[PDB]
Symmetry: C2
Subunit: 381 residues, 2 copies
Amino acid sequence: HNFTYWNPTKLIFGRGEVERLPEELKSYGKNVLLVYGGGSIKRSGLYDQVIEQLNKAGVTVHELAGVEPNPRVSTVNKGVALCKEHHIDFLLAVGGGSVIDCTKAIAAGAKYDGDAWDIVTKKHQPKDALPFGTVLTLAATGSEMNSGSVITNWETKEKYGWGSPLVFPKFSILDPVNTFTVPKNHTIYGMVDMMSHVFEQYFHHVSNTPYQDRMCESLLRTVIETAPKLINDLENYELRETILYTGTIALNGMLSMGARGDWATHNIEHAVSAVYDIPHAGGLAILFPNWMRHTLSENPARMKQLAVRVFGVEEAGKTDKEVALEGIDKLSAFWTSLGAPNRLADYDINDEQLDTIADKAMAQFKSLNKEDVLAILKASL
Amino acid sequence: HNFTYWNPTKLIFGRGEVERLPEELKSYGKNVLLVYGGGSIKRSGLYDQVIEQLNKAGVTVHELAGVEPNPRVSTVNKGVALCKEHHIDFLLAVGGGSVIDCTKAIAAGAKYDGDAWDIVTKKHQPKDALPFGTVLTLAATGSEMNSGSVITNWETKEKYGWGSPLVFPKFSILDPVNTFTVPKNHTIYGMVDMMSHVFEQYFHHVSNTPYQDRMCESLLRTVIETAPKLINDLENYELRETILYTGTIALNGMLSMGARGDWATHNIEHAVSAVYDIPHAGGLAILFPNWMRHTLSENPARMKQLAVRVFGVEEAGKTDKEVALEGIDKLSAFWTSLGAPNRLADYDINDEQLDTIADKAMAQFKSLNKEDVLAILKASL
Ligand SMILES: NC(=O)c1ccc[n+]([C@@H]2O[C@H](COP(=O)([O-])OP(=O)(O)OC[C@H]3O[C@@H](n4cnc5c(N)ncnc54)[C@H](OP(=O)(O)O)[C@@H]3O)[C@@H](O)[C@H]2O)c1
Ligand SMILES: NC(=O)c1ccc[n+]([C@@H]2O[C@H](COP(=O)([O-])OP(=O)(O)OC[C@H]3O[C@@H](n4cnc5c(N)ncnc54)[C@H](OP(=O)(O)O)[C@@H]3O)[C@@H](O)[C@H]2O)c1
């Protein structure tokens, strides 16, 4: 997927664009399942606005409320039952990546006569899915315009990504105002996640053009410049707009399907979230820099390039490796300066379960084995 | 369409990616109409490669050869008759924007019991279309990933753009090698056209984010830096790759659907091509800068921004209007430095038919009337 660029979701970006819902729903069925999280959309007033638009569209509404961060497969199965109960034609996901990922799993589960966990574990390949669209309230995992979904089995302590072109969103409404009330920590997590997709793309071997590299470096620089201002001024339209734009539309100009499918490359983060339920991007901030150090290429050209072009590392009097490692230091220091965690200790995680986590994570050049995962976990304590 | 970002075509980018045709054709029917132009694809060897892949796909091939630059509706109607005769399931356009635009009109015409010119003139809105894909051989009109098509009626001397979401290409294969033999003049025209889509986006009112502006400015600067090198080294892979990337994938990060639909904003170029059959982007090089001068906003902030940030105009001691107009001067001077035409005289066009051309062009704030069109034409003689 590294040479494939495919983003078929219709994006509508701007203030008040929830009012485009009736037009976008016109071609779909009238029985709509509205899927959302723990209540933030009611506190912001977005819920009432969505209901108002759904009434204007003449649709019959039922709801699945309470999707959890790191969405549970029990919640997926509950949504599937609601789809059968209410003869749902179309789903509307209003929330963040957990809500959208959950809606994708419901949309596919609705066409499968079995436990939705079979889709997550790739036991059943989806052959059909209900259509759905999104109203994004957190910038920005990419789920609002990609084909992947990451679901937790809390009973077995497993968290796995799966995907299907049948669960690309039909449309996604992207309004910076709808991200105003994302609290500080999840605003940080959203930006850590955005940046991580760009790193994943950049680290591909011999599949980036030089201009694509410039696009990625500029994106990273703009997130880095904007993030400290946003975290101290969370209801600022232009700051929220910058992060929403750079985390959504802009990335269609540089991210391959492989980078948008990078939910297949974070086994360690998944295993830690599977056991302790920490936010995915909190795991990224703790673990990804130590993964970069553990796997830094013996030709550190690509990370050297990022260190110099994004993190302003002065290479005079340094080896290329010193420059590359300094870039990783500056990345982690930047995330920490926003308030991101940088040790498992920050989430009250000690070394008690590192062996079990490594086993769960293990369930080309530089690929990891169990000792690699254990070493990265220990370095992150 | 200025707040909508929608590019559903699957893009496959890189050397040799014509070999992905069988995988992509798996999902479509086996009766394929292969559509191409005047023979450049046979001289380059691409024709034989495509035939080999179609055989590998088990496809039954029929051909429509000889699509002309500024494709004629007679060619469209001929393709429609072939679709009915041979029970065509899928079309494969191998060529440039004229071939792809023609294929779109055939794909929609194949579901319409009437003259395909009714679709071009918007008398008939397509309600269905055959699916199709492309192999792009000229960088890059955007037809390979947008929903529009510009067709000439050579009998009536008319050229009109039309569009429909039903004629987005399913997939497009983008290999820089397939553009190596584009001659110098059409290499120039492709880059003039690329740049003009970016200008169209940039000129939208209050619908660009600041980061989007930076993306557009950077794209323009890179084409400007790359174009003179490419025109003197046409079979250079990295130079062809830069122009193909900036003219295709990169633009999905900054162009709204309205900018990708800017075939509705070039009435004057269309009328001149309708009468004299000149290349569309030759018309752009001659007419677009004079349209910019004729319509320069009385708040020249946006064009001043382009003048300073893209064309490096030093604003010290100058008015904002002087700077904006100098930017337009620098744009036209740049296109001319590549070899693009800058006067209607360059195509042996005098003033004899300007009134007829203005009538053909006339068939919101700053919209043009006939006197406006005549003034721009006279300024361009
Ligand atoms: N499919 C992919 O490719 C992909 C990529 C990256 C990450 N992911 C996954 O996405 C999930 C993380 O998604 P996420 O970072 O967007 O966060 P999230 O888990 O969807 O939500 C995190 C928190 O943000 C709150 N929230 C969201 N929008 C809010 C708003 N406008 N105002 C106030 N609070 C708001 C939510 O509260 P409420 O519940 O009350 O609304 C929730 O508690 C992870 O499970 C990750 O594995 C998937
Ligand atoms: N749909 C839209 O939104 C949109 C946007 C912009 C422009 N347009 C339209 O696109 C058309 C212009 O398209 P275009 O600029 O791509 O050019 P084109 O009209 O498709 O082709 C121009 C010339 O380039 C030759 N050619 C193409 N690829 C070649 C290659 N690899 N090697 C050698 N020769 C090659 C062609 O020769 P052969 O015929 O022998 O192959 C032809 O003579 C216009 O009619 C314009 O109105 C549409």
